[PDB]
């Protein structure tokens, strides 16, 4: 119930389709749910996600980005304390990754 409204709002936000009476909204939604029900991936391996997180930290340390390395270790260690964790992490990881070298600018 909540999940259906969630997939609606994801189409609205991500695709920029704020009118549900657009046929493109319903086509993107049908695409979304059909992709969701096409089970084709293995389940998330928490250990591989952990290894990837550590490797991101090492890449930060290698490039002498000390504030981003300290931030990265700090945020990942706080988040991993109270499955879905590794899911969201992997999700973000594959989603763009784009300027992982850039965009440091650690405000907090």
């Amino acid at each position: 119930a909540q999940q259906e409204r969630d997939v609606r709002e994801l189409v609205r936000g991500v695709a920029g389709l704020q009118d549900e009476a657009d046929p493109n909204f319903q086509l993107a939604l049908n695409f979304a749910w059909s992709n969701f029900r096409f089970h084709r991936f293995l389940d998330v391996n928490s250990h591989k996600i952990e290894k990837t997180i550590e490797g991101i930290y090492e890449k930060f340390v290698i490039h002498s980005d000390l504030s981003k390395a300290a931030s990265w270790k700090r945020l990942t260690e706080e988040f991993l304390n109270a499955d879905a964790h590794y899911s969201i992490l992997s999700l973000l990881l594959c989603l763009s990754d784009s300027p992982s070298n850039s965009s440091y600018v650690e405000t907090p």
């Binding site: 490797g55 890449k59 340390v61 290698i62 490039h63 002498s64 990881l93 763009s96 990754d97 070298n101």
Partner: protein, 373 residues
Amino acid sequence: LIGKSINFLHQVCHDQTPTTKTDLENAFQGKIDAAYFETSKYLLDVLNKKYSLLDHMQAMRRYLLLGQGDFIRHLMDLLKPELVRPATTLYQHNLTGILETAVRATNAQFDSPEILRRLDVRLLEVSPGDTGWDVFSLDYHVDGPIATVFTRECMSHYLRVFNFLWRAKRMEYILTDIRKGHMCNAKLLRNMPEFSGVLHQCHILASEMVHFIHQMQYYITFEVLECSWDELWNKVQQAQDLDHIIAAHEVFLDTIISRCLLDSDSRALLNQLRAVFDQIIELQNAQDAIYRAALEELQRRLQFEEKKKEEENKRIGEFKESIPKMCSQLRILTHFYQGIVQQFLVLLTTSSDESLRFLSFRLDFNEHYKARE
């Protein structure tokens, strides 16, 4: 110290001469110094010959500190077309063999198989983004008894300095490609009365980049890997303890971190230095952005001559439209670069006591930035 040395000599090296040999009527000052002498001297000898500590250091300068130069340029020269293509379709299979062609061509081929075996490729910390030029790294594996002098935490320093001196030696080659484009193309553009201005403006702007990428790159040569190498070579060549090797090795790495811009305080200076890495790849594109229009038309003009065997007046006209925008753009780029390098120098003056202070006098003799202050 003595008991640790003789226990290490049994449990690790496994080469044994069996039973290696007022206070309380004073036998201590007689026994202990002789024992200390014999034990430590044998331990140093057997570690530098049975597992060869020194030959690894010489290939840690040539390979990891990139100080060889012949291998390093010819390797990267053969490695350019791979790195220009994005790194998701690049693997170790294509790394090790082009390394091998470089190795058989260069001075590396004569050397011992141990140090050559211990150089092998690695991928730089694989993460999506398709950064083709960034994905390459050397992993030097130490798994002997000498691992204790070449521990994994100071190899990380080797990796970091290798990374910075990968970026810089990439940019230098981009720059000399610009300089090569000048000496190849411009003897064809002497037949242009209008592009002469903008190409000449690029000639003038380029030499400041060349200069900035050759003053830093002689400070990095002759004070970062020539003085540091010497003082380290002294402090290894005399040293008469395992501790004495290790505790000079560590601070040699730290001192080179202080000489370059990779300290926690000199991050601000490193940002200024990265802003010169912006402009060089910018100017590289602009130089070819000339030729893809400018050189392109003259062949078309030749074919227009073959037609005859009013159109081209408009090609003159659209160029007299195009030239001022490109020239003024180049002007603003020049201003921007000079201003940010002045901002680099003004923070540079008081950072460290001597090392970074000397760099100010290297990068400016002319005192252009006393007359542009």
